[PDB]
């Protein structure tokens, strides 16, 4: 007994293991287990492809499950490693199944860099292998029927999922075998053979003829359509066509023979005869034209036995008129069969190797979130610092809070003395002098590291060129020049980072040189400092003066405001939200992840309380600097312009400017120091990367 | 602020 099956497609073996491992290492921390388990699995994958595909050999469910196991593992991997995004050079090469092309060759191949192409072929082979196992089954047997019926319906569903997946995934024209019309015809043949099987079970289980006639008729309807599809497109092996034709006929005859047992049961004798004659015609034709592909003898002997006896009984006894075919009611149809939907996992006991691996969808989103968090936070920080700077500069340029605390011109105003002690307490000028001294050394330490590193490259390159010049034959490997261009481009970049640092060093140094001497004064013991501040005869309207208490409370409000910026900045920086989860969720319940909208709404939840206040500071400062200047310019009427007070004025203005500068400078110097300190970390790893590559080579 | 960006 002959059933159609499909042969596997062939593939050249490819390096799955290495292109994948590249991404893995360039995404997680080198030396950790989030780099470990995703290399142990990447190798097990590469092996598993070879075992599933690497040979057209084994012909049972061990090898089918390995294929199925392989299909599910591929499908599971797609949302990880960026395949959709193109920069992975994994190219899959498959050969036509049928040696068919829409061109006059003997074979044709397609090699594509597309996981979608890969997965279709794997599934075709799953379909095909299942077909071969089904065709092999022993059909006089309950497990034979059941295994074939399940495998044909799988093959039919597998081929149909291929029909609806190919053109989208694969962004080329597929080979003829995995082409929609082919794979759609194959799906229907598999469905048909699955009916055949159920028609065979009903026969073996001695079910009612009415039933069997209807199952045979359904099969015949399925085989006819498959036949038609084939009449004007020769895309399948040469044996498919005549087998479809014979099976179509045999199933019409089985339908007619069974319905003929009905007609007899109902004393429709002319109909018995007409239907039997039809069964005889089809089988006679099948026996002579398709003798290579079927054996139909018993059934022929059984038709004729039944027919002679009906004609004996009719001619003598009953005398029933034999109708034309055209006048007979259609035999019904009953399907007991379905194309099996493909839904991973199709393998049993499936386990996902890269289950723990976070999807790319999240990575991109999680990264892009951080660049939006970063803008919002620096945004807010820089705005505030710019403001406090500008407020301090205005208060200095107007001798405040000093002026309104300047009882006589005899002593050190309380605020100036307060600022002084803060400077003395933070170490004084020694702290600024020491940081300025060590800055060129931390610079030099970084130049040292960059040069020694590139020198390694230079020295290895020179000997590599000499060896290739002297031993042309004995020394053939890619030149050092080409291997080193990546590292040498990190190098030229680092250089530019250093060019920027130097200029910044310049800025701090000039400001340091421009303000040293006034700071040194500020740091002097209180009576010593008072001696260097010129005395003046005070403008004595400064007892209960109303213009004073307005400035006084106004400066308190300005003080409040700027002191508050400090707890704001710190809260802006100390908080954060791990967003992986909110991303994970939107991925599983929705089609895709839209981070923009999802992150905006969460950055408003986490940071909105603080961004509001940051804004309520800037504007509040604006308001305070408005009616501090228009208020001050009135206070200035109470003070008169003479030489002794112009002098004290400037010294006071300049001592306050000095405190501002000491504070700014300490912050700048400690910023430069941490920078040159983090940069050594960057550069040591670069120096290490240079020696590893100069010694691996 | 003053000193260049360290990110990569």
Swiss-Prot record, chain A:
Changing residue 675 to A: Loss of interaction with SDCBP. The keyword Cell division applies. It is found in: Cytoplasm, Cytosol; Melanosome; Cytoplasm, Cytoskeleton, Microtubule organizing center, Centrosome; Secreted, Extracellular exosome. Changing residue 508 to D: Abolishes interaction with HIV-1 p6; impairs rescue of PTAP-type L domain-deficient HIV-1 p6. The modification N-acetylalanine is found at residue 1. May be phosphorylated on tyrosine residues by activated PDGFRB. The keyword Phosphoprotein applies. The modification Phosphoserine is found at residue 480. One of its GO terms (cellular component) is melanosome. The modification Phosphothreonine is found at residue 478. It is linked to Microcephaly 29, primary, autosomal recessive: A form of microcephaly, a disease defined as a head circumference more than 3 standard deviations below the age, sex and ethnically matched mean. Brain weight is markedly reduced and the cerebral cortex is disproportionately small. MCPH29 is characterized by small head circumference apparent at birth and associated with global developmental delay, impaired intellectual development, speech delay, and behavioral abnormalities. Affected individuals also have poor overall growth with short stature, mild dysmorphic facial features, and seizures. Residues 2-391 form the BRO1 domain. It comes from the Eukaryota. Residues 417-697 are annotated as: Interaction with SDCBP. Residues 175-502 are annotated as: Interaction with CHMP4A, CHMP4B and CHMP4C. GO terms for molecular function: calcium-dependent protein binding; protein homodimerization activity; proteinase activated receptor binding. Multifunctional protein involved in endocytosis, multivesicular body biogenesis, membrane repair, cytokinesis, apoptosis and maintenance of tight junction integrity. Class E VPS protein involved in concentration and sorting of cargo proteins of the multivesicular body (MVB) for incorporation into intralumenal vesicles (ILVs) that are generated by invagination and scission from the limiting membrane of the endosome. Binds to the phospholipid lysobisphosphatidic acid (LBPA) which is abundant in MVBs internal membranes. One of its GO terms (biological process) is bicellular tight junction assembly. The modification N6-acetyllysine is found at residue 214. Residues 175-697 are annotated as: Interaction with EIAV p9. Transmembrane segments: none annotated. Self-associates. Interacts with SH3KBP1/CIN85. Interacts with PDCD6 in a calcium -dependent manner. Interacts with TSG101 in a calcium-dependent manner; PDCD6IP homooligomerization may be required for TSG101-binding. Interacts with SGSM3. Directly interacts with CHMP4A, CHMP4B and CHMP4C. Directly interacts with CEP55 in a 1:2 stoechiometry. The interaction with CEP55 is required for PDCD6IP targeting to the midbody. May interact with PDGFRB. Interacts with SH3GL1 and SH3GL2/endophilin-1. Forms a complex with SDCBP and SDC2. Found in a complex with F-actin, TJP1/ZO-1 and PARD3. (Microbial infection) Interacts with HIV-1 p6. Interacts with HIV-1 p9. Its main location: cytoplasm. Changing residue 682 to D: Reduces interaction with HIV-1 p6 and EIAV p9; abolishes rescue of PTAP-type L domain-deficient HIV-1 p6. This is Programmed cell death 6-interacting protein. The chain holds residues 2 to 698 of 868 of the full protein. The gene is PDCD6IP.
From Swiss-Prot, chain B:
A motif (LYPX(n)L motif) lies at residues 2-6. Interacts with human PDCD6IP/AIP1. This is p9. It comes from Equine infectious anemia virus (strain Wyoming). The chain holds residues 456 to 463 of 486 of the full protein.
């Amino acid at each position: 007994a002959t059933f159609i099956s499909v042969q596997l497609k062939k593939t050249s073996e490819v390096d799955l293991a290495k292109p994948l491992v590249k991404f893995i290492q360039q995404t997680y921390p080198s030396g950790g287990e989030e780099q470990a388990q995703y290399c142990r699995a990447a190798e097990e994958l590469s092996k598993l492809r070879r075992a599933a595909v690497g040979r057209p050999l084994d012909k049972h469910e061990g090898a089918l499950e390995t294929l199925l196991r392989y299909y599910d593992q591929i499908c599971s991997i797609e949302p990880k490693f960026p395949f959709s995004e193109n920069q992975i050079c994994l190219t899959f090469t498959w050969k036509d199944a049928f040696d068919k092309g829409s061109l006059f060759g003997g074979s044709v191949k397609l090699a594509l860099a597309s996981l979608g192409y890969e997965k279709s072929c794997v599934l075709f082979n799953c379909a095909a292998l299942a077909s071969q196992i089904a065709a092999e089954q022993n059909l006089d047997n309950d497990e034979g029927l059941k295994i074939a019926a399940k495998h044909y319906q799988f093959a039919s569903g597998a081929f149909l999922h291929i029909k609806e997946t190919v053109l989208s995934a694969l962004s080329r024209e597929p080979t003829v075998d995995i082409s929609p019309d082919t794979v759609g015809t194959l799906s229907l043949i598999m469905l048909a053979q699955a009916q055949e099987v159920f028609f065979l079970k009903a026969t073996r289980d001695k079910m009612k003829d009415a039933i069997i006639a209807k199952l045979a008729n359904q099969a015949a309807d399925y085989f006819g359509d498959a036949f038609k599809q084939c009449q004007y497109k020769d895309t399948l092996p040469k044996e498919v066509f005549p087998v479809l034709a014979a099976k179509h006929c045999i199933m019409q005859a089985n339908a007619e023979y069974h319905q003929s047992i009905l007609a007899k049961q109902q004393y429709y004798f002319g109909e018995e005869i007409a239907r039997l004659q039809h069964a005889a015609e089809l089988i006679k034709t099948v026996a002579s034209r398709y003798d290579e592909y079927v054996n139909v003898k018993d059934f022929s002997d059984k038709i004729n036995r039944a027919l002679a006896a009906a004609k004996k009984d009719n001619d003598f006894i009953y005398h029933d008129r034999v109708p034309d075919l055209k006048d007979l009611d259609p035999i019904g149809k009953a399907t007991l069969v379905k194309s099996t939907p493909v839904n991973v996992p199709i393998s049993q006991k499936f386990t996902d190797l890269f289950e723990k691996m976070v999807p790319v969808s999240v990575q991109q989103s999680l990264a892009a979130y951080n660049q939006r968090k970063a803008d919002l936070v620096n945004r807010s920080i820089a705005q505030m610092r710019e403001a406090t700077t500008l407020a301090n500069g205005v208060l200095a340029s107007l001798n405040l809070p000093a002026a309104i605390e300047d009882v006589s011109g005899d002593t050190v105003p309380q605020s100036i003395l307060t600022k002084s002690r803060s400077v003395i307490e933070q170490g004084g000028i020694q702290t600024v002098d020491q940081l300025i001294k060590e800055l060129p050394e931390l610079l030099q330490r970084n130049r040292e590291i960059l040069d020694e590193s590139l020198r390694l490259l230079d020295e290895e390159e020179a000997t590599d060129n000499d060896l290739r010049a002297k031993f042309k034959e004995r020394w053939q490997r890619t030149p050092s020049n080409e291997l080193y261009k990546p590292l040498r481009a990190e190098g030229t970049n680092f250089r530019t980072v250093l060019d920027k640092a130097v200029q910044a060093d310049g800025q701090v140094k000039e400001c340091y040189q421009s303000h040293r001497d006034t700071i040194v004064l500020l740091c002097k013991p209180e009576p010593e400092l008072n001696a260097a501040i010129p005395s003046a005869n005070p403008a004595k309207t400064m007892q209960g003066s109303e213009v004073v208490n307005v400035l006084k409370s106004l400066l308190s409000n300005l003080d409040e405001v700027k002191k508050e910026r400090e707890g704001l900045e710190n809260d802006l920086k100390s908080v954060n939200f791990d967003m992986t989860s909110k991303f994970l969720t939107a991925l599983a319940q929705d089609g895709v992840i839209n981070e923009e909208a999802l992150s905006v709404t969460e950055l408003d939840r986490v940071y909105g309380g603080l961004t509001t206040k940051v804004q309520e500071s800037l504007k509040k400062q604006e308001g305070l600097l408005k009616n501090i200047q228009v208020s001050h310019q009135e206070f200035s009427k109470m003070k008169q312009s003479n030489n002794e007070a112009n002098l004290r004025e400037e010294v006071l203005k300049n001592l306050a400017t000095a405190y501002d500068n000491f504070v700014e400078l300490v912050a700048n110097l400690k910023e430069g120091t941490k920078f040159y300190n983090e940069l050594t970390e960057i550069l040591v790893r670069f120096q290490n990367k240079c020696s590893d590559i100069v010694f691996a080579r | 602020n003053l000193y260049p960006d360290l990110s990569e």
